[PDB]
Amino acid sequence: SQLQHNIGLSIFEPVAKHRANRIICTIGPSTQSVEALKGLMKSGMSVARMNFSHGSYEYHQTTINNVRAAAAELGLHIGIALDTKGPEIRTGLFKDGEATYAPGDTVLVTTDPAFEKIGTKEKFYVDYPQLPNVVRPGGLIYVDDGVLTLRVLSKEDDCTLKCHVNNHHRLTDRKGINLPGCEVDLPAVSEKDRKDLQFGVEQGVDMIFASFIRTADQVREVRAALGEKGKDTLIISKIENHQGVQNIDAIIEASDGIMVARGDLGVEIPAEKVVVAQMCIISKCNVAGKPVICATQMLESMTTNPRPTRAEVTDVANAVFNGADCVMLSGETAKGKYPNEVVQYMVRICIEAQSATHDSVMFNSIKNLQKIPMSPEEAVCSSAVSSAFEVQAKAILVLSNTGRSARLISKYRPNCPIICATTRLLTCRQLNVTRSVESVYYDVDAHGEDNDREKRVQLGVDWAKTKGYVSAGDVMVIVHADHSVKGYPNQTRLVRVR
Amino acid sequence: SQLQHNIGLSIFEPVAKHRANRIICTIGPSTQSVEALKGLMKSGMSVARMNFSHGSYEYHQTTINNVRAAAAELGLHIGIALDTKGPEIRTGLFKDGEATYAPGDTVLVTTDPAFEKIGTKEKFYVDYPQLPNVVRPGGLIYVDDGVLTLRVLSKEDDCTLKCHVNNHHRLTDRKGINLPGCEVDLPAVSEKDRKDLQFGVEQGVDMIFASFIRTADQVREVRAALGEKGKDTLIISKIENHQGVQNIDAIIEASDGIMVARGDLGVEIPAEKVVVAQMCIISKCNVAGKPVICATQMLESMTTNPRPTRAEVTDVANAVFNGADCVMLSGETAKGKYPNEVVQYMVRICIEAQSATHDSVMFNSIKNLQKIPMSPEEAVCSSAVSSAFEVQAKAILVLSNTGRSARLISKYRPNCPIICATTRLLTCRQLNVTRSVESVYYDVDAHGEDNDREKRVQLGVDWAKTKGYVSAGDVMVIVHADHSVKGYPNQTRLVRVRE
Amino acid sequence: MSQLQHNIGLSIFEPVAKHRANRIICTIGPSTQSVEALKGLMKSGMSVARMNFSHGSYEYHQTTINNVRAAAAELGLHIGIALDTKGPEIRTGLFKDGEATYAPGFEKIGTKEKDYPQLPNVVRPGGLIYVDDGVLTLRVLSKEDDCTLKCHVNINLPGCEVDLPAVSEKDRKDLQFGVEQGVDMIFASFIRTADQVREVRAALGEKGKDTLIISKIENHQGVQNIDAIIEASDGIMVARGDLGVEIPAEKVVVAQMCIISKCNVAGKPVICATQMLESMTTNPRPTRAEVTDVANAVFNGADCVMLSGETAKGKYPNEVVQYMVRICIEAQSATHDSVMFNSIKNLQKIPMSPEEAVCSSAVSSAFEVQAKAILVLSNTGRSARLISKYRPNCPIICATTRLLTCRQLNVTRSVESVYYDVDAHGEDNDREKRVQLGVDWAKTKGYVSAGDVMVIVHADHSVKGYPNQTRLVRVR
Amino acid sequence: MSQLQHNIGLSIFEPVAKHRANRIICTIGPSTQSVEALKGLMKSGMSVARMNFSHGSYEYHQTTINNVRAAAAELGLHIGIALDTKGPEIVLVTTDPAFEVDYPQIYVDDGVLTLRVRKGINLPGCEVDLPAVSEKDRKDLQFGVEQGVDMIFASFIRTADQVREVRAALGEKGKDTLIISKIENHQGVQNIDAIIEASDGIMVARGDLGVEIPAEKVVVAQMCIISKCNVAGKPVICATQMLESMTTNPRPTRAEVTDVANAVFNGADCVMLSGETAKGKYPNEVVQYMVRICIEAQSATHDSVMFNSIKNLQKIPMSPEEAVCSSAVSSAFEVQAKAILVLSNTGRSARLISKYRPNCPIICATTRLLTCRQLNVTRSVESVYYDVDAHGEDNDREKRVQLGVDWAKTKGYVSAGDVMVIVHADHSYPNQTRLVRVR
Structure with a gap:
């Protein structure tokens, strides 16, 4: 039981060496410069957010180019998220x-x-x-x-x-x-939102943070606003109204992930109800196997102070316990006086929370809530996680070009990291929103075609060895496809490193 | 599973009609006046807290006299807590x-x-x-x-x-x-803390909030500082250092309850470790069946703002979810610009978190962690809670003079309120630290001996039917003693409320 | 929580339970109709004596009645008599x-x-x-x-539903005889519809209103209509004889498990019935199959286990009841933990009646304090059947004012009845005489002693009609 | 999980399992020694043919051997022959x-x-001294090994040292023959854990056990032993008076049906017939009923309960070999796999998969014939022999895997559009698991 687990918590036990939770930072005047972004990255930034409620396309082009420059210097693949203005x-x-x-x-x-x-x-x-x-x-x-x-x-x-x-x-x-008890009736993709969406698709944004999603058709309206060019870009729907929470199941199926936008939600619904709403949304996304983000006033005091309140620390911590893939910052990074200090504090809390929640409990909870029969894909991904738990695997290596398989492995919440040997750089960037994943880019052009996906596996194992996740003798769970099929993985291997 | 529970939560379902969690408020310049205290109570102040780190005995006498005057106005029994300056x-x-x-x-x-x-x-x-x-x-x-x-x-x-x-x-x-990490030679009960505790006892303070408790010997030092006049006053030990967390089990046994003083704890240990420390302490107190308080920056922004952050709301809710009996307000009520507004906000969060955790999970968790055989006193109390769960009892009525039985019933976390027919006023005030309890004082002087325990029962059921807890036609679990071997309640009745 | 984890830790050579919870029902025939043979059976383990109405005149069944009453009177016991109808065949x-x-x-x-x-x-x-x-x-x-x-x-028509009266002209005369005699329970043969049970209930008038109806499931219909049959009855018999022929032999195991567990959740006495120790009709000891059959009937959750011809026409009638006793105590000793209790309680729908909430809590209280016995003041036996429903490890002592309920409680596991004679001792409107009678009976029968904690269930000061009060008393 | 919750809810008249997992062991006597009676038994459901060496000359036991091999050859089956040792005899x-009788001391x-x-x-509990491998027993075992018997049913095993005495009696030649220890005494039950580790499997010889210990205690002893073998991952057999009435009658008592079902419910890999097939008047009829009961009991316990019970009782970390095999079972449960294909040469990989009790069959693509006959004691395995000298070397996951898939399709286990779990070893012990649609 949770009680029996809490009474045996060892407060002063060594923490997890590898952070599984991901940090999303909104970019503003304090952090638009390449030096400030390099600081944020080096601090723990996984996805750079652009609030399209304010700013010209020139201002948002600067954020794009600077994030790409800063990530290039540090040799990282940082995702760029376009946060729409919406029916505001x-x-x-x-x-x-x-x-x-x-x-x-x-x-x-x-x-x-x-x-x-x-x-x-x-x-x-x-x-x-x-x-x-x-x-x-x-x-x-x-x-x-x-x-x-x-x-x-x-x-x-x-x-x-x-x-x-x-x-x-x-x-x-x-x-x-x-307007709390008022059914608005406004377009999700307004004439401004539409053009904002054509700019991002053009300049290559990785994901969209769709504002004020009320229905399942609203997330579909956004899907159509990005053409065949923006067909692969992710749609993270922002729940910030009564209608959204009410239609959460439909919104989840239609979206690629969900954001618990607590800013407008805390005003559209009573402040006390947001806690219950957050728990319920995050767990629904966990069962669904879709990235869920937490989003407002998480470390708000750190916009002006070098340390957070006791409330902020328990907030970021419980966001992790409730099952969130990501945790976000708004005023803090964008307009704050301590932007690197706030990302660093969030990192410490996320690692503490995930060290306390080193469990087979979440995996069993999620697995038991899945309908049988499963698909050979999902059945391989869930068993890859159980295999890891049984052999005490130091890491799981997945060969996923689209990232489906990596999101599917992460769905079953393993305690070890998930290394993804991807061929698409878009996927390395899009997997910054999924818990425990650590992507590795295989450059197919420069080398060879690679029929037998052995090079990709060796690239993953070597990256895992050097990044200190695995060491000579450790057991590693490898997941990929056999050479008679493609499209989805069907094979799982348990390998001792070399 | 918790996952399977969260998934089926109904965000917009109606909340619980009766608040189980308790609010502790520090009293300062903003709330020392009788009118301000009347506001805090009418707001939900269960325990008035006096921080003895600052203030003369004259200033602290004013808080005492004013709390008593205010609770007298609303006809309430509000506990007064003396929070020691302590070692550091x-x-x-x-x-x-x-x-x-x-x-x-x-x-x-x-x-x-x-x-x-x-x-x-x-x-x-x-x-x-x-x-x-x-x-x-x-x-x-x-x-x-x-x-x-x-x-x-x-x-x-x-x-x-x-x-x-x-x-x-x-x-x-x-x-x-x-200065965390130093061999600091400062005592638990300094010469000032003996005069402070002797003042409390002489005044009638209901409980003590002992600062910087590290060892179980320190608790006995405080217990000895209150003499024969202070032998019944509660000792709530404040864990705010590495030693206190390390020796939590020994202190729990020695104390009457525990306070997770997160202020100094967050500085003595890393800030991130406080969450793990809080969960672990609260659950240890739950299994022990002793009142645990969560405190320090709960709704801190509300000292200057009329609404709290999204972090402050999840902090108060998770303190409840963790299993805390009480949640405390430090400078928010003492030096704040919105003291009644902050208690009101805490109330709605506590009721929300309570309505979400309206389950037999906690009782199951706690009961299974008790070693068998249980004493007939605890076996009657725990079964009184399971009976309530089975019949969907809208209230449990306990006849407890010391509050031992009421603290023992609350230990098994029922979803319904616990009405305590106590012969003591000190018990009415000390039970403001235990979840669900709602004390009812039977005179005994301006009434009878009630040797047969019937009048107190009739006082109980009438107090609930009036305070709207129970409505004619729904059961009530009545816990008391049946004329035998002295020392414990041993009888449990299931009674349909009459009209 | 696993059954596997429980089995690995079984200490086969550990000491057995001091008090037998399961009940034995025996068929009475030529080998056991005499008062001396019946006295032997009772001292051996018998709780209910069966009168198979398939064969025998009313004079013959009258000698079984009179002899069971005589033998029980000599031994100072309250043994129930069951009338097992010829039924439709x-x-x-x-x-x-x-x-x-x-x-x-x-x-x-x-x-x-x-x-x-x-x-x-x-x-x-x-x-x-x-x-x-x-x-x-x-x-x-x-x-x-x-x-x-x-x-x-x-002879037998399988799978298909048949149109035969529930109470045939013979059964009508049988049931009317039973009622006039004072038979404690009826074992209704070939029950297929819950309407048939009410047909039997109507066959016994206001005179036979209180007599129990144990429905015998021995056809495809009775199994596929089980639930409603279990609501109209007072208990169920898994009549495996005709069931094994009406349905495939292999299906009877699954049918037995399913029926017994359904009766457990319902809180109604369930009886396992045919070839349980069949070899002992001619041999002094049973096959390895029969020992595992009796044990698993107990393991499945059966209140009672039965002997048809082992005791009726057998050469070893006291020897067979004694073996059944040894197996029942062994299976009981292996089934020591609160697995069944929690199992049954969690399958009950909330809200429970204050009556059932007191009974179930009386069982949990017993588990918590390791109570040596539970004492229930039940005139009808309802409350005692309701306490037994939650399968406690300790015995249930029932302080009943009715001899009919002393006899009818021989079908419910863990129950040992104590008859309080009102007409002799007094009215006991304060209920203390029946309480002290129960504690004293538990002391002398060695269940409890000084220092032991006992759970005492009855009705309080204002209340009348159902128990609502529970006490935890340390025996003085 | 909750046995009660599973029982309430059982559908008595639901369709049964099309493929039998539990295995039947038959003792061979005058009624069934003939090739045509053995062909009948095998068609009925005989997986292992037992030879009780307490009675019979080596000429008589040579006839049983040769006839079992002849009958199995006609039907194209791989039936295991079990040598049941005399042991210490009083x-x-x-x-x-x-x-x-024979004991003078x-x-x-x-x-x-x-x-x-x-x-x-x-003599129940008298300090009666007699060796595990007596001079006759050494001569009985040397005959078995020279003949090619698949497994040994060692009588009156009391210590783990006795098992090693038997293992030494077979030597270099009989190193691969299995040792199933018979528990039929008080200390054989008392030292069960040591004996389990030492043995390849266990027999709950209820005949002598019911006399050495009280009759009522045998039920508890059976449950405890079978579950210990279940956690260990070693074949356990239930053994005496299983369907005893069928030695003379065409139908069993209601007790005999619940006894066979319980043995399956308890977790037994195999169930045994002694007299019933050896000296019985209805030998094919008794195996047939046993089959019907085993399929009914299997069908009822179709669930992942046994798998989760056994898995949770294993200490972590697991070997990559067991973590692959237990995960192969969980994958099967998730996708509702119509089969599990294992490429096991010794059978140690197939025994490890069967340990986690899957609802589907376990097809074993074995390069040995000894493995095909020794896997008649483990539940759910249906072996397929790949002749290396006939087809080819096959060091790649291709020919055996194809033979295994083609076998499961012709035997009706798998059809076009069904998912199968394939367990074997990679290019660079098994370490790889495949989920394949049969096409």
Whole structure:
């Protein structure tokens, strides 16, 4: 039992030498420079995020080129994630840049472009032109990350609502709007989102972080926005509304992975419900075998402080226990005063958490929740993990060009690292979002065609030996395909190193 | 499996109608007033905490008298906890209240009382007089939440150390130094802590929160510091050092409960290790059947903000999930701008986490880790919990004068509340540290002898039916003694609530 | 938690259990009808005496009744009497002057050449038709006139559902005799529909309302309709004799396991029934097969184990009951842990009634304190059957005010009844006399002593109608 | 997991397993010595033909050998021959040989006669001294080895040293012949662990065990021994009065059916017939019933419960050899494999797969014939002999693998569109596992 496990935890036992969890960092003014990115990488960055809510294509081209430059110097394969703006709505601008609100007062909330830049404490503009028709009296409007709440009194006009101010707050220029009990009805791929998606496909982004995914058809709408050119790019759906959590199963099947975007989720749903929502989403992704990311205020204090609160440490730790592949940072790396220090702290917590959770428990929990019969592919991948547990394998080597097999091995959560002998550099980059994987790129062009995939295996074993994972005499589980078939692996080997 | 449980959780299902976890609040300038305390209680303050590291006995007498006045207004029995200063020390005062330190610089750390109030960026005072002989060169001194680090260069004299500043920091008057890794000769109950504990006992404090407990002998030192007048007051030992974690089992046996004081623990041991330490301590206390408290930076952002971070919410929920009886509020309620708002937020998180863990998993886990044979007292108590689970009892009623039986029922973590028909007020206050319990005091003087135990039972069932726990037509598990060999409840009844 | 991990740690040469939990049911025939033979059987292990109504006049069954009551009275025991009905069965009588021969390839005057009127209509073309123990078979040549059909040499109709009354004209007279006599339970033959059980329940009037109905599963229908049969009954008998012929012999093992476990979860007494120690009808010791058969019937979770002809027509009747006792105690001693208890409790749907929640918790309390015995105050025996449902390791003492329930509790495992005479000792409205009677009986019968903890289950101060109170008492 | 939860829910009239996993061992006597009675037994379901050496001349036992080989040859089967050693063998009773049991330094025939201070005499727990390999036993074993008997059923094994005494009696020639130790005493049960390690398999000889120990204790002894052999990964046989009534009757008692089923349920690889086939009036009829019961009991315990029970009782880390074989079984469970193909020459790889009790058969592509006859004692293995001198060398996973696949298709185990698990050794002991669709 969990209780029986906790009572026997050895706090001062030696930690795991090889980090299995992955860190995603958003890139902003503090970390756009090649030197700052080299620092982030050297610190523990696996995927560099670009928030497309703000920034020109020139600004986002700089992040792309700099990540490629920094990773090239360090000889790493770092993924680039395009985080879409999505069906998001903010307020207008304010006359003299501010507006103070007192409780008991009344504010007209217009969708009239005349008040777009002339917003006062008496009347102000909001993006959504369908807002007076969506929000009905009694309904609450959550201006600025729910710190200002407005109850709807009446729809005075065609495109204006009279609202009663609940709490004292001073708002400023262009701040986000949330509608909790309101079914929005807005496009997932807006005309801006569409072009944002054609830019990334062109310049080669590895994955998409689709904002405000509500339905299974919404993740399909994004799939169509990336053409045959962007057919292989991953779709990580961001759950940040009530509809998303409600339709989580459909969204999971349609997506390549999921992000528990806790920022907007904590305002769209009550703050206390986010914990239960996170646990439930992460475990559903675990059973599905799809990468799940944790995302907001994980180490928020470290944007201004050199050390995190006791709350942040237990947050990043429990994100790992709940089963997250990745953990992300937003303000911290992008606008923070300690960007390398925050990634380093996250690394220490992730290694501590994974050392406490060195278990065959997650593997058995996930395996038992899978339907029988399995596919020969999955049956080989799950047994490769059980073989590793039985022989105490120091590493699992998978030959996966697309990364399916590597994601399928990682699905069964082994304690050892997973080395992936891939031929595609896109896959080395896309596997930065999957727990325990360590990709190795085989350059097929420079050498030979390689009919018998023996070179790829020797490349993996040698990389595992030199990177100190394996040492002479250790047993290693090799997974690949036989030379009579292709498409998917069907063979598993247990090899003592040389 | 936990996986199979999480998968079927219903995010938007209605929450539990009755809160089982308990909230402990530190009292400071923001909440010392009767009106502010009335707000905290009405908010959910179960234990008023007095940090004796700061404040005169007159200031701490005000907190006592005001807590009693406030709980009297709402007709509640709120426990008062005396949190000892203890062994480990704090720095001196500073000239103009502040002093900024830059890396690569040098600071002289004196133990000279002349610099006690005139501390500059060049030289400042520290409480520990034995410090220059304990800290040897190359050793680090940890100042202000272990933020500022000072590497000892050399021993200047009889009571001074020259230190090389590692990081940029500006600290203020009387902020703690930790120095982890040194053979520190500071006692558990110093001459100040004996006067502090003797004050508590003379005042009637319900429990003690003993600071920097390392050994089981230290607990007995504290137990001896409270005399024959303080023989029933609880001893909650604070684990905030490497030794205390290492000797956790011995301290658990010696104590009445444990506090995971994460503040000093996070500096004495690496920050990441505190999670593992918390899980391990809480579960050890669960198996033992002793109240465990989680504390330090639980909802820290709410000292200045009206809403907590996404991290603060998962911290309070996992403290509950880990098996903590209580969750504590330190500066959030003492020096915070939102004291009622922070207790209210903690309440909703505790109820959410509670509603998600509405299972027999914990009881099963705890019960299986008990060695057989059990005492008839514990076998009646554990079976009273299993009976409740089987019939879906909406409440368990225990007749416990000392609270032993109520602490023993709560040990097996039932999903329903535990009503305790106690003849003691001290018991009503001390049971604010144990999960699910809701005490009911039977007069005995302004009532009868009730030798037959019937009046207390009728007082119990009436208190639940009124406080809305039970509704006419649903069972209740009643635990008490049946007129025989003194020393334990031995009888369990299953009764349908009448009208 | 594995059975494998349990088997590896079995200490075969360890000491056995001090008190036998499983119950033995014996058939009474020419070898054991005498008071002396019955006194021998009881001292040997018998708890219920069976009266096979397939053969015998009401005078003959009256001597079994009177003699069982006499023998039990001398030994001061409360032995139950079971009426096993003739039931619905197709027949064929005495052959060529008592016996002849049939080679492969007037319904009682056949030799070897040429009952149910619904036979050509109930049985469709093709299939199997059984004659004389199922041993001889019948391959129907063509569809024929009257009732009988022309058959080729290669009683019972397999797989297929038959239309025969549950309470035949003979059974009606039998059941009415039983009720008038005061028989404790009925062993209803060839139960196929839960409606048939209620037909039997209606055959015994308000006079026979309290008598138990143990349904005998011995056909395909009874097995495929088990669940409803287990709800309308008071207990079940795995009548393996006719079951082994109605269904393939190999299927009976799986059918036995499945029926016994279903009865365990239901909390109803289940009885294993045919050829359990068959060799001991002629030999002083059993085959290696029969010993493993009795043991596995106990292992499967059977409350009772039965002897049909071993005790009725056997040459070693006391010797066979004694062997069954040794096996039952061995199998019991090997089945020491709370595996069955937890097994059964986890399969119960929540909420439980306060009555069953008190009973199941009384068993868990016993497990926790290592109770030497559980004392239940049960007039009807419901509560005692409910405690036994959760399979405790210790005995259950039942302080009952009714002799009928002292006799009916011989079918429930771990139960030892104690009769409190109200008309003699008093009304005991405070229940202390029946409690002190139970503790004293457990002290003298050596179950408990000084220092031992005992779990005491009964009804409290206000409550009337069901037990709701549990006590843990250290015997003084 | 929960036996109760599995039993409630069993569907009595569900379709049975098409392929029998459990194995039947028959003693050969006057009723079944003829080639045409043996062909009948083999068709009925005889996997191992036993020869009780307590009775019979070497001429009589040579006839059984030659006839078993003849009958198996006609039917194209590889039937193992087991030599059941005599071992240590024990009113007027004055020893005095002239007045003519065999012990000159008390029960008669399965416990009928008794008293207080050529019929099987048994003195329960008297310090009775007699060697494991007596002068006759050494002569019986040397005959067996010279004849080619596959396995030895060593009588009255009490110590692990006794097993090594028997292993030395066969020597250099009989190094490869299996040693199945018969537990039929008190200390043979007491020293079971030592005896298991020393042996190749165990027999629960319930005949003498039921007399040496109380009759009721044999059930507990059987369960305990079979499960110890299960964890060890060594063939265990159940043995006496299995279907005893069928020596004279065409049908068994309800007790005999539950006894055979229980033996299977307990985890026995094999189940044995003694008199029933040797001196019985219904020898083919008794093997046939035993088959029906074994298939019914198998069908009921179709589950991964035994596999998980055995796997969890193995200490970690496992050898790459056992980690491949146990994973081959879990892969089979996951994909619902219609078979497991193992390329085992000794059979040690096939015994290791059978150890983890899969629901599907284990086809063994063996280069030996001795392996084909010795694998009649392990459950689920259906051997296929590859003639190296006839086809080729075959050091590559090709010809044997093809023969094994073609055999499983013609014998109806696998058809086009079914997944099979192939276990063998790579190019650079087995270390490789393949999951192949039969095509």
